[PDB]
Design a protein around this ligand. Sequence first.
Ligand SMILES: Nc1ncnc2c1ncn2[C@@H]1O[C@H](COP(=O)(O)OP(=O)(O)NP(=O)(O)O)[C@@H](O)[C@H]1O
Ligand SMILES: O=C(O)C1=C[C@@H](O)[C@H](O)[C@H](O)C1
Length: 165
Amino acid sequence: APKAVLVGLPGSGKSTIGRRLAKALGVGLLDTDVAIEQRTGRSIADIFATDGEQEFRRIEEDVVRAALADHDGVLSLGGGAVTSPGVRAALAGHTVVYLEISAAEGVRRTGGNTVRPLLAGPDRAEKYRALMAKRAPLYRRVATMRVDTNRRNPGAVVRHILSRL
Ligand SMILES: Nc1ncnc2c1ncn2[C@@H]1O[C@H](COP(=O)(O)OP(=O)(O)NP(=O)(O)O)[C@@H](O)[C@H]1O
Ligand SMILES: O=C(O)C1=C[C@@H](O)[C@H](O)[C@H](O)C1
């Protein structure tokens, strides 16, 4: 079973905080978005364009159930994984950390285009605020620890978590 599992919106810090926490405990990192590209032929934007979001979600669920059984290090999840009811039932019993961020700082952190099919195009600030309103009740229901990332630098986030494990 993992030592910790990380969830939240794009730009909260899931990949950055996960690398740094794994180095301090002595263990490996597994990132489910990276695992998906390795197993199929292609990119995340390629699968969304040829096949659709509902077929992305079925591949993501099967990857997640297997990681929770076989991996003893730190695990980082994709941003919309909590919208599947089969993902929420596999998480019950596990150690789960929710990273919180405001809408104005969150949109400024995503600013140098990694891509992101669901944030693409004009009116970026309007689309980010609509994603927050519908997911926030879902992050609160799955969590066992909540941490505020608004005025904490990344080394100080790591130390707050380490003392509560
Ligand atoms: N506490 C922090 N303070 C200052 N900058 C930060 C903080 N956390 C993350 N960043 C920066 O914000 C950017 C995004 O962080 P990242 O770790 O990629 O988040 P993400 O939650 O994994 N995205 P996704 O899987 O696509 O939903 C990076 O350049 C980081 O360097
Ligand atoms: O639905 C989402 O919010 C996301 C889906 C994919 O682009 C990626 O899995 C990303 O982390 C965000």
